Design a protein around this ligand. Structure first.
Ligand code: ZN
Ligand code: ZN
Ligand code: ZN
Lengths: 65, 33, 47, 270, 134
């Protein structure tokens, strides 16, 4: 269902960081917690954001017109 | 050799096209996987 | 160019027509059909 | 050596944080600003989407919502009046920035729509305003949405002034940090414990910068509070500094308008 | 937050916290009467009858339906229909007075008999409010 542009708690920009997170894994083969420490996401408010969002859109895009 | 009525088949059961169908198939049949 | 109207569920493609013009698509017997947006422009608040 | 009172002493610094130690003021004051920064700092973002065509999976207002969150430039903002004030019936280049956006799913492999794709169409009047603040590694910034084969999406946005009160999308803020009297010497808290209050409760990095307790000594009941370790972040729209200066400013403005109404009020009477 | 209710960060609600969606699907067909007496999907008005409705019919294109983009509200009409009785009695379909939003997708298919079958969906985004439940 796409990356939640900016966090709910503090709102700190977070709609870009997505692709970079997904990569700091499949490729840079890191672990969640750190991957996020790497993308600047410090305090949990913004953390839980990525670490939880489910990018459904992909399964959506996979349909038709 | 005569025909008699229609049986409201169950979904995802053997007599359902979906029973066989997979990933792709469904998404194209619109049917949610 | 040229305006459109309705559409096909899978062989989706502008279609149009009216009264007693059947219902099926010009191909897919699939007798569905949506109506597609209005030329009229919509608008929303950014909240 | 100089300066009347409320002095600062920036601790660390960066393009996205002003970890500083503000000191010698009223906590009231401290907080007052703290707030002002989050709340009433003029910014800019979209506030009016005009969907032409859309085939995406995200229906209109979904996109229409996020678009308001896409941080936009606002350095100069103070020279782009709020629609409401300007005399242009609706909006104009002297109050708003107009953007465009158009996507078609050519790459038969998930095409993405990024904030970088916004198109300023209205005269930027020659002023840092309306630019899709990007901090992305690549420079694509803020993934708006995706789409498949012949999925299209034509929009047209209109940015306006606005502040965090009217909506969050105008929050230059992000999230500040706040703390004072790291050794609770005024006793503004009553630490809950199971055993040693000192153990269970972690200490803070902001203790080094202040003298430990030292038993013996009684309780300083005359103890007040200066020295506040803030950490003004930012989202971009405004340079981490301004989100502090302007903060220091907007507040100061209002404080005067009170005097202003106290003047206009006097003059009044027959 | 007192008594099994709470306080919700407004700011966050804005940034999109808990926003949801909502779709409804009004629907209708063309009635028949053996003796080839059938109904219709048009955008009627005077024509004798008086038997009409109250919601701005306008939003009804000619096929008697609303195009997807339209912004529907009060009791506006979503389906212009008529009936022959022995001459243009209404059988249209107004919106749910309470609800209102944006048309989301209309579709017209045949139907086992042959009758014109139409379903209309309306989209609405519902933001968390002071009374909402959680
Ligand atoms: Zn956060
Ligand atoms: Zn077809
Ligand atoms: Zn203007």
């Amino acid at each position: 269902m796409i990356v939640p542009v900016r966090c709910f708690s503090c709102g700190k920009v977070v709609g870009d960081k997505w692709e970079s997170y997904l990569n700091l894994l499949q490729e840079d083969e890191l672990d969640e917690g750190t991957a996020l420490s790497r993308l600047g996401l410090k305090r949990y408010c913004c953390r839980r954001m990525i670490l939880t969002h489910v990018d459904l859109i992909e399964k959506f895009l996979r349909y038709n017109p | 050799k005569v025909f008699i009525g229609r049986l409201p088949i169950m979904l995802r059961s053997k007599n359902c096209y979906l029973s066989e169908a997979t990933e792709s198939d469904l998404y194209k049949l619109k049917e949610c996987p | 160019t040229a305006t459109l109207k309705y559409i096909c569920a899978e062989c989706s493609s502008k279609l149009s027509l009216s009264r007693t013009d059947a219902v099926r698509c010009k191909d897919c017997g699939h007798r569905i059909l949506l109506k597609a947006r209005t030329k009229r422009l919509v608008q929303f608040e950014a909240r | 050596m100089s300066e009347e009172g409320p002095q600062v002493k920036i601790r660390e610094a960066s393009k996205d944080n002003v970890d500083f130690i503000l000191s010698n003021v009223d906590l009231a004051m401290a907080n007052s600003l703290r707030r002002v920064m989050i709340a009433e700092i003029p910014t800019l973002a979209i506030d009016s989407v005009e969907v032409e065509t859309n085939t995406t999976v995200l229906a209109d207002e979904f996109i229409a919502h996020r678009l308001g969150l896409i941080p936009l430039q606002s350095m100069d903002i103070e020279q782009l009046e709020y629609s409401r004030d300007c005399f242009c019936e609706d909006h104009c280049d002297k109050c708003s920035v107009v953007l465009t956006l158009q996507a078609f799913g050519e790459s038969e492999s998930t095409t993405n729509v990024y904030s970088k794709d916004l198109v300023i169409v209205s005269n930027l009047m020659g002023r840092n305003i309306g630019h899709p603040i990007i901090q992305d590694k690549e420079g694509n910034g803020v993934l708006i949405c995706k789409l498949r084969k012949g999925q299209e999406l034509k929009l047209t946005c209109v940015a306006k002034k606005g502040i965090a009160k009217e909506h969050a999308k105008w929050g230059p803020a992000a999230a500040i940090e706040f703390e004072y009297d790291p050794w609770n010497k005024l006793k503004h808290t009553d630490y809950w414990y199971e055993q040693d209050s000192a153990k269970e409760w972690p200490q803070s990095k902001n203790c080094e910068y202040e003298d430990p307790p030292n038993e013996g000594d009684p309780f300083d009941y005359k103890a007040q509070a200066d020295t506040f370790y803030m950490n003004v972040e930012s989202v971009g729209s405004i340079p981490v500094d301004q989100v502090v200066v302007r903060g220091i400013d907007t507040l100061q403005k209002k404080v005067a308008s009170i005097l202003l109404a106290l003047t206009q009020m006097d003059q009044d009477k027959v | 937050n007192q008594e099994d209710s709470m306080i919700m960060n407004q700011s966050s609600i804005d940034r999109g916290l808990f926003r949801s969606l909502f779709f409804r699907s009004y629907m209708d067909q063309e009635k028949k009467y053996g003796m080839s007496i059938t109904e219709t999907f048009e955008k009627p008005q005077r024509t004798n009858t008086l038997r009409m409705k109250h919601g701005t019919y306008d939003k009804l294109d000619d096929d008697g339906l609303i195009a997807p983009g339209v912004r529907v509200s009060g009791e506006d009409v979503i389906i212009g229909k008529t009936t022959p009785i022995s001459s243009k009695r209404d059988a249209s379909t107004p919106l749910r007075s309470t609800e209102n939003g944006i048309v989301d997708q209309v579709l017209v298919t045949t139907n086992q008999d042959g009758l014109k079958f139409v379903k209309v969906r309306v989209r609405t985004t519902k933001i968390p409010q002071i009374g909402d439940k959680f």
